[PDB]
Amino acid sequence: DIQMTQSPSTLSASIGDTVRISCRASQSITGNWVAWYQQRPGKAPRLLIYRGAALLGGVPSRFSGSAAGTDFTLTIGNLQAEDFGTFYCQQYDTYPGTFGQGTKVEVKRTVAAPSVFIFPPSDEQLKSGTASVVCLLNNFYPREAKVQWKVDNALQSGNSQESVTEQDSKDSTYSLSSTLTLSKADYEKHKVYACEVTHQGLSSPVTKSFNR
Amino acid sequence: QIHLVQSGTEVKKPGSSVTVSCKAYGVNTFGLYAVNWVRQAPGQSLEYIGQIWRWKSSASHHFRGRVLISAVDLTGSSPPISSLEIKNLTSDDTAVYFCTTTSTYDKWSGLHHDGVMAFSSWGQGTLISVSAASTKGPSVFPLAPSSGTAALGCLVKDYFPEPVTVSWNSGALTSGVHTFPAVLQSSGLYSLSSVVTVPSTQTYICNVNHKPSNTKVDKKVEPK
Amino acid sequence: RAENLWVTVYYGVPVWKDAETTLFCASDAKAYETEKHNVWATHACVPTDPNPQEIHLENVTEEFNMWKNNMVEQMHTDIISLWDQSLKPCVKLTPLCVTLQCTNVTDMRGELKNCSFNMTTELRDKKQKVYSLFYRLDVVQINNKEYRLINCNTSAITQACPKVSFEPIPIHYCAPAGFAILKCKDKKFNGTGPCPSVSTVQCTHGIKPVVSTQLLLNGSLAEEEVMIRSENITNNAKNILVQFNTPVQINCTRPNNNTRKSIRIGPGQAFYATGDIIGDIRQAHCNVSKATWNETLGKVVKQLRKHFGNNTIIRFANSSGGDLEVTTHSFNCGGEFFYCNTSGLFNSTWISNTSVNDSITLPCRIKQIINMWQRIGQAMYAPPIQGVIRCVSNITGLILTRDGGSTNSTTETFRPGGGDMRDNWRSELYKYKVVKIEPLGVAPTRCKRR
Amino acid sequence: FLGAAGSTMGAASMTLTVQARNLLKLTVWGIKQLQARVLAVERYLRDQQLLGIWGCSGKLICCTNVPWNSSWSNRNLSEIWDNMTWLQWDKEISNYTQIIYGLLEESQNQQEKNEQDLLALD
Amino acid sequence: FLGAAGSTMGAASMTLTVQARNLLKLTVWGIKQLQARVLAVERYLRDQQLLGIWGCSGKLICCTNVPWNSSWSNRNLSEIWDNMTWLQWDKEISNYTQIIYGLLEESQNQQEKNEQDLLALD
Ligand SMILES: *[C@@H]1O[C@H](CO)[C@@H](O[C@@H]2O[C@H](CO)[C@@H](O[C@@H]3O[C@H](CO[C@H]4O[C@H](CO[C@H]5O[C@H](CO)[C@@H](O)[C@H](O)[C@@H]5O[C@H]5O[C@H](CO)[C@@H](O)[C@H](O)[C@@H]5O)[C@@H](O)[C@H](O[C@H]5O[C@H](CO)[C@@H](O)[C@H](O)[C@@H]5O[C@H]5O[C@H](CO)[C@@H](O)[C@H](O)[C@@H]5O)[C@@H]4O)[C@@H](O)[C@H](O[C@H]4O[C@H](CO)[C@@H](O)[C@H](O)[C@@H]4O[C@H]4O[C@H](CO)[C@@H](O)[C@H](O)[C@@H]4O[C@H]4O[C@H](CO)[C@@H](O)[C@H](O)[C@@H]4O)[C@@H]3O)[C@H](O)[C@H]2NC(C)=O)[C@H](O)[C@H]1NC(C)=O
Ligand SMILES: *[C@@H]1O[C@H](CO)[C@@H](O[C@@H]2O[C@H](CO)[C@@H](O[C@@H]3O[C@H](CO[C@H]4O[C@H](CO[C@H]5O[C@H](CO)[C@@H](O)[C@H](O)[C@@H]5O)[C@@H](O)[C@H](O[C@H]5O[C@H](CO)[C@@H](O)[C@H](O)[C@@H]5O)[C@@H]4O)[C@@H](O)[C@H](O[C@H]4O[C@H](CO)[C@@H](O)[C@H](O)[C@@H]4O[C@H]4O[C@H](CO)[C@@H](O)[C@H](O)[C@@H]4O[C@H]4O[C@H](CO)[C@@H](O)[C@H](O)[C@@H]4O)[C@@H]3O)[C@H](O)[C@H]2NC(C)=O)[C@H](O)[C@H]1NC(C)=O
Ligand SMILES: *[C@@H]1O[C@H](CO)[C@@H](O[C@@H]2O[C@H](CO)[C@@H](O[C@@H]3O[C@H](CO[C@H]4O[C@H](CO[C@H]5O[C@H](CO)[C@@H](O)[C@H](O)[C@@H]5O)[C@@H](O)[C@H](O[C@H]5O[C@H](CO)[C@@H](O)[C@H](O)[C@@H]5O[C@H]5O[C@H](CO)[C@@H](O)[C@H](O)[C@@H]5O)[C@@H]4O)[C@@H](O)[C@H](O[C@H]4O[C@H](CO)[C@@H](O)[C@H](O)[C@@H]4O)[C@@H]3O)[C@H](O)[C@H]2NC(C)=O)[C@H](O)[C@H]1NC(C)=O
Ligand SMILES: *[C@@H]1O[C@H](CO)[C@@H](O[C@@H]2O[C@H](CO)[C@@H](O[C@@H]3O[C@H](CO[C@H]4O[C@H](CO)[C@@H](O)[C@H](O)[C@@H]4O)[C@@H](O)[C@H](O[C@H]4O[C@H](CO)[C@@H](O)[C@H](O)[C@@H]4O[C@H]4O[C@H](CO)[C@@H](O)[C@H](O)[C@@H]4O[C@H]4O[C@H](CO)[C@@H](O)[C@H](O)[C@@H]4O)[C@@H]3O)[C@H](O)[C@H]2NC(C)=O)[C@H](O)[C@H]1NC(C)=O
Ligand SMILES: *[C@@H]1O[C@H](CO)[C@@H](O[C@@H]2O[C@H](CO)[C@@H](O[C@@H]3O[C@H](CO)[C@@H](O)[C@H](O[C@H]4O[C@H](CO)[C@@H](O)[C@H](O)[C@@H]4O[C@H]4O[C@H](CO)[C@@H](O)[C@H](O)[C@@H]4O)[C@@H]3O)[C@H](O)[C@H]2NC(C)=O)[C@H](O)[C@H]1NC(C)=O
Ligand SMILES: *[C@@H]1O[C@H](CO)[C@@H](O[C@@H]2O[C@H](CO)[C@@H](O[C@@H]3O[C@H](CO)[C@@H](O)[C@H](O)[C@@H]3O)[C@H](O)[C@H]2NC(C)=O)[C@H](O)[C@H]1NC(C)=O
Ligand SMILES: *[C@@H]1O[C@H](CO)[C@@H](O[C@@H]2O[C@H](CO)[C@@H](O)[C@H](O)[C@H]2NC(C)=O)[C@H](O)[C@H]1NC(C)=O
Ligand SMILES: *[C@@H]1O[C@H](CO)[C@@H](O[C@@H]2O[C@H](CO)[C@@H](O)[C@H](O)[C@H]2NC(C)=O)[C@H](O)[C@H]1NC(C)=O
Ligand SMILES: *[C@@H]1O[C@H](CO)[C@@H](O)[C@H](O)[C@H]1NC(C)=O
Ligand SMILES: *[C@@H]1O[C@H](CO)[C@@H](O)[C@H](O)[C@H]1NC(C)=O
Ligand SMILES: *[C@@H]1O[C@H](CO)[C@@H](O)[C@H](O)[C@H]1NC(C)=O
Ligand SMILES: *[C@@H]1O[C@H](CO)[C@@H](O)[C@H](O)[C@H]1NC(C)=O
Ligand SMILES: *[C@@H]1O[C@H](CO)[C@@H](O)[C@H](O)[C@H]1NC(C)=O
DSSP states (O other), rough: OEEEEESEEEEETTOOOOEEEEEESSSSSSSSOOOOEEEEEOOEEEEEETTEEEEEETTTEEEEEETTTTEEEEEEEOOOOOGOOOEEEEEEESSSSSOOOOEEEEOOOOOOOOOOOEEEOHHHHHHTTTEEEEEEEHHHHSOOOOEEEEEEEEEESSEEEEEHHHHHHHOEEEEEEEEEEEEEHHHHTOEEEEEEEOOTSSSEEEEEEEEO | OOEEOOOOOOOEOOOOEEEEEEEEEEESSSSHHHEEEEOTTTTOEEEEEEETTEEEEEETTTTTTTEEEEEEEEEEOOOOOOEEOOSSSGGGGOEEEEEEEEOOOOHHHEEEETTEEESSEEEEOEEEEEEOOOOOOEEEEEOOOOOEEEEEEEEEEBBBOOOOOOEGGGOOOOOOOOEEEEETTTSSSEEEEEEEEEEEOOOEEEEEEBTTTOOOOEEEEOOO | OOOOOOOEEESSOOOOEEOOOOOOOOOTTTTTSTTTTTTTSOSSSSOSSOOOSEETTOOOOOOSSSSSSSSHHHHHHHHHHHHHHHSSSSOGGGGGOOOOOEOOOTTTOEEEEEEEEEOOOOOSSSEEEEEEEEEGGGGEEEOOOEEEEEETTTTOOOOOSSSSOOOOOOOOOOOTTTTTEEEOOOSSOOSEEEEEEEEEEOOOOOOOOOOOOSSSSSSOOSSSOOEEEEESSSOOTEEEEEEEEEEEEEEEEEEEEEOOOOOSSSSSSHHHHOOOOOSOOOOOEEEEEEHHHHHHHHHHHHGGGGTTOSSSSEOOOOSSOOOOHHHHHEEETTEEEEEOOOGGTOOEEOOOSOOOOOEEEEEEOOEEEETTTTTTOOOOEOOSSSEEEEEEEEEEEEEEOOOOOOOOOTTEEEEESSSSSSSHHHHHHEEEEEEEEOEEEEEEETTOOO | TTTHHHOOTTTTSSHHHHHHHOOOSSSSSSSTEEEEEEEEHHHHHHHHHHHHTTTOOOOSSEEEEOOOOSSOOOOGGGTTTOOOOHHHHHHTTTHHHHHHHHHHHIIIIIHHHHHHHHHOOO | TTSSSSTTTTTTTSSHHHHHHOOOOOSSSTTTTTHHHHHHHHHHHHHHHHHHTOOSSSSHHHHHHHHTTTSSSOGGGGTTTTOOOOOHHHHHHHTTHHHHHHHHHHIIIIIHHHHHHHOOOO
């Protein structure tokens, strides 16, 4: 039973760049039985290269494979917009076939700082017995960011959920949400709620709060 | 050319049995074409389930005997169809299932390797969500802007099953809108949000359509 | 340094790849004693090995496609190329385009025309006033009744030599050295998919190049159940080839007892004109026994329901329309070319297992001047035959088409196909394909060298 | 005659020998029964020239001084002859086949015969 | 491929291997693309038969028991391989070429194989 390891799990690359995604198998594969797949978000994965160097008919010449022993690598020159997505490596060498971790190829662009907005709980929600505070992160680069919740200058673990948009089609940016779910009783016992965000764009610490 | 059309979205509860079908268009027969069933866990990688090749059904040691892959050839009324059945459904089976096929006629082709092979043609995919939860209507709350510039949006909470379609001004407002993907709450209910960026009167609205619960409910947004 | 093995060359390892080569024929070395001045193919044609070899390959599974088979294309071009080589040495009929003054023969609406015309003799001085007898299908009027040869406006024409015969003789296809021919030994095979039991042969079995439409004549019988074959089944644009279990007795005769004029259009050349008809005044007819055709139909109509569903209505009907080669049953018997009306056989309507006298007949038309395979520039004149021609053949299969009108979920109707003659060769060639042997191989072993 | 094609490579070495071998004035069809057998003798000599220029110089089986690379079908010896078949074998080596061919003609009979000439002087 | 033809015989021994090797239904031009390649295989086998009947029995380089006569290009060994070229070499031997050929087939493989048969008895 083979185990496929990909590196990296995700990477930032620009247009025109030559992208190299490697992969390593738990054992040595000879006869070079290895496949590389491309998957655009929300779409079914498409077959690109089989047997490690053999490109499928209809695929552009910009894609190139390399296969030696335990170490495998796929080389993509002149990166273009349609090439961005998640790629997978697969071995059909032995029963059964096993895939790789997957590699998310992500658009590179100037680092953009988010514009933080905080939304206090709605009135009708308060009558339900629960209160949810929503912290918003608008268009920003890169995707990696931290949002912490301080209530009256004290950190909170649990009851917190965040959501992330896919990289924008044009802006090539991300958008992030944060959901804090608490009850009505515990909500009345505290005064000030704060949203602390730290990201590569800010180059300074930011906090958004409301006095209700 | 080659087209693989699978069944619709199946939402079934644990312990039950689910059957998905793959209608294979453009394929002359399953004699020259091997059929493989592959699943993809959400946010995770791809996993090989089983196959039917030379009219012989087979599956991985994970699923041995628990998974049944049957197929009938090209008929006079419809293209070749394959079917996958999974009994004793669990919560870990929630992966998206794919119907795949590969050309086996070329004996010296690199596509196949004695039963274990690559997958040339991919289907539309079929999502199977396994949960004991019962269908419920979404709760909609407005998010009012306090005050740089301004941002306003609507909050959709506690709905089931997915999906729900959220619009703005009935599709009149398409720009600056970012709809965040549904998050699975600890209660087994889904919650998402749709926010719009505004400068500076227009008096926007939210359009929410949940087809499983048949609730087309619409909520407005007022600044406090 | 680091151990252990070393590469070693093995010659004659069992490795082959699917490929295409140039195949020759084989006549069984008896066809040569049949003589009659180069019957059909066989002249220098290779004598078949008295003991053909068939080697069964155990523990082997090979995938076959009969529609992608290359042996069919060579044979199709062979019969065509064979046909021209037969007409080259023969007598060309070029100055037969003379005006034809014709009249109605002494019943059944005057199918035969008695035609008077002017002709060139051995000498180039005086013409020749002579009459001949042509079928209505061989002539066309131009504006008493004046006619002309039907092929003259389209193309040229040449007469087939009376010495040679069109009699189909068994022909074995073989492969040269370094190649091999695979044979599928399963009883039930539709021509596509994997084959469990495969054997190899130097030569294919005895194959009689019988050219026919709407009916496979003198072919090979299937095993057990009757077979249903189609390139693309759900597609109504693709013909459906059928293989029979039991052979169907068919009789086609020429109920006209004729004579040969053998007029002299010298120097050295002699044309064979059709003289007066002495005998039954009748149109050519084809016989099929009502009991035998029905039984096959009942067994065949059940096989279509392995695809079109357990229960459905299958109706049969005669040809839709087109060229005469398509709309009728075309073949050669005794040297003459018959075109039969199969409309009487295909008139039926079937229930789930059943359908709602001692004999049956089929009106046949005779045409001496023919262009088959859509050939332009060359028209062949079939020479007249002395006496009454009688022939008995096996009906081993059909060429069928499905209607496009649907109403797919309601009922389906099937009609006799035609056109492509490759399907006729695909009928006998479905179990064979050509591969080239790759003998050279390398394997690791300890022997090294001194 | 090909009988072991389905069998293992180990059993296939016994029947190896059987695989080695199985008017004319016409204007036409004479080229059809000719063109087939002429490329046959051309294809025949094509294999034999390779056999001579390599370390064989003889038919059936012959050995060489070319060491088997691990990167080429890294395997167990019993996993090759005893557990595997030729059609299945030629499948994996398909990539290294052209590489191996070079080692026989270049690394051996070019470098071996010259090596031999130098060893034949003394 | 002929690259050392201008170079000395000594340097020309390294590239020796490269020199070894580099519808059809038409009534006419089919004989033009045929007659050329048929005499080619006839010319090919013409050289190979000589190679077998001599003391070679193998391609590329092979040696013999025929002693080199002084009367045949009396020379210095370094004056041959190091200082001289093949086109220039075959020029002088042109007279003795037919003589040498006789010594290989007659004096050797006729008298050698018989000598061998007598040495193989004991
Ligand atoms: C040309 O020609 C050719 C030749 O000639 C041809 O071919 C063909 O084809 C056909 C098609 O069409 C075919 O048939 C088919 O087959 C298939 C397969 O079968 C197989 O398999 C199966 C399954 O398997 C599995 O299971 C078992 C149990 O038993 C086991 O054992 C095995 O092993 C497997 O398993 C595996 O896996 C697992 C997981 O998954 C693991 O764990 C393990 O380990 C492993 O790996 C089976 O069952 C079978 O068996 C059977 O059969 C046989 C015979 O055949 C036998 O021997 C046996 O014993 C049995 O038997 C029984 O059954 C039968 C049935 O029929 C009967 O008959 C008897 O009697 C008894 O009872 C085998 O093995 C199959 O699948 C198919 O089936 C289908 O179809 C039918 C009609 O026909 C029906 O009825 C059925 O039902 C089915 O259907 C299905 O599907 C569809 C589609 O998909 C759908 O639509 C429907 O609905 C259905 O579904 C259903 O069911 C299911 C279940 O199944 C479920 O799920 C669902 O939900 C529903 O309910 C068929 O049959 C044949 O075979 C062939 N042949 C040869 C020779 O090969 C062709 O076709 C031609 N072409 C043209 C064009 O013509
Ligand atoms: C041998 O013979 C057999 C038969 O004798 C031949 O079989 C034929 O094969 C052809 C294939 O070449 C088939 O045509 C294709 O049909 C598929 C499937 O259509 C069916 O199913 C669709 C969806 O069904 C599902 O959803 C519904 C709704 O929930 C559900 O109720 C249902 O149960 C099922 O779950 C239906 O939409 C579709 O109906 C439509 O079409 C009918 C046929 O014309 C028509 O009667 C209806 O009224 C209706 O209009 C039908 O039921 C089609 O998907 C496929 O369409 C592709 O090809 C056409 C060209 O023909 C092209 O114009 C399309 O754009 C489409 O191409 C898309 O898919 C490609 C593959 O993924 C992709 O590469 C393209 O780029 C394109 O995708 C783009 O657009 C989409 C959005 O449109 C976007 O998301 C993508 O990202 C991308 O941008 C063909 O029409 C024949 O049906 C079939 N014959 C029969 C009788 O069925 C066989 O070919 C022969 N083979 C040989 C070798 O001889
Ligand atoms: C180890 O060894 C293996 C040995 O297999 C190596 O694998 C081979 O590696 C090569 C390295 O590049 C590959 O070359 C490239 O192949 C691409 C795809 O080739 C295959 O797919 C074709 C597409 O098929 C699809 O589309 C058709 C048409 O719609 C559909 O019908 C199909 O169903 C598919 O959907 C397919 O057509 C090919 O088959 C044809 O070619 C092969 C030879 O390559 C023949 O064996 C086949 O019989 C067939 O030829 C027939 O059919 C065609 C029409 O299809 C006729 O024109 C012919 O005359 C003949 O009748 C393949 O199976 C190519 O697209 C690609 O070309 C592009 O890229 C190169 C640069 O890389 C450019 O130079 C080109 O100009 C073009 O842009 C390239 O040739 C082999 O495909 C691959 N597999 C093989 C040989 O089977 C492996 O690499 C080795 N490992 C290492 C490390 O080296
Ligand atoms: C599918 O396969 C089937 C079966 O294989 C094919 O059917 C074959 O059809 C062939 C004809 O096309 C037929 O060949 C016939 O063989 C008969 C038997 O020959 C044997 O017996 C005689 C003794 O009678 C031996 O001497 C001989 O050596 C053989 O051993 C012959 O009798 C046939 O000759 C007669 O028929 C043909 C046309 O069918 C005429 O051209 C021929 O001239 C003969 O006709 C004259 O003779 C009969 C009486 O025998 C008279 O009734 C008739 O009117 C003719 O008489 C006049 O004409 C002659 C000159 O022509 C003149 O001398 C006389 O005085 C009169 O004026 C013919 O040779 C095959 O045998 C038959 N197969 C089998 C197994 O029987 C079928 O065609 C195939 N399908 C296709 C599409 O090809
Ligand atoms: C296509 O043509 C072929 C060939 O003509 C047809 O196939 C032939 O079909 C006929 C009838 O179906 C068949 O003739 C019978 O053959 C029997 C042997 O198989 C004969 O024994 C029998 O002869 C008797 O009947 C004749 C007519 O009644 C008598 O004239 C004859 O003398 C026989 O009578 C004797 O026997 C009885 C006892 O039974 C005795 O009391 C009498 O004293 C006397 O001794 C028939 O002739 C042929 O055998 C068939 N030929 C072949 C090769 O199979 C086919 O049917 C045609 N198809 C179509 C669609 O028309
Ligand atoms: C069409 O095919 C059917 C069969 O599906 C034929 O039916 C056959 O009819 C004959 C009678 O003409 C049956 O013979 C009868 O046999 C029984 C039993 O021995 C006997 O009692 C009767 O007196 C009579 O002899 C025959 O059995 C029957 N076929 C089957 C399979 O039962 C029919 O004849 C065919 N069409 C034509 C042209 O008749
Ligand atoms: C076809 O027509 C020709 C005449 O063009 C017929 O031949 C004549 O037959 C009569 C008999 O009634 C003779 O008296 C004449 O001398 C014949 N003339 C010629 C030129 O031959 C012929 O009989 C007709 N067809 C047949 C033979 O029935
Ligand atoms: C072939 O057979 C059919 C069926 O008998 C013939 O159809 C007849 O056509 C004529 C007109 O030519 C009609 O008057 C008859 O009523 C039709 N018969 C039936 C039963 O409907 C057909 O003519 C025959 N031959 C050709 C060449 O069409
Ligand atoms: C038969 O061949 C297959 C594949 O060539 C092989 O897996 C199997 O072991 C063989 N059987 C025997 C008994 O050697
Ligand atoms: C067809 O018949 C089979 C048994 O003969 C039966 O299992 C199947 O359900 C039938 N299909 C129908 C009636 O659609
Ligand atoms: C190699 O073959 C031996 C047979 O003696 C077997 O015991 C061993 O497990 C094999 N090892 C591998 C890595 O194939
Ligand atoms: C022979 O060659 C040697 C090279 O060592 C040279 O010194 C000598 O002069 C040469 N003699 C003749 C006669 O060529
Ligand atoms: C080049 O060739 C000539 C004649 O073939 C020869 O005299 C000369 O020495 C050669 N040059 C070198 C550098 O060997």
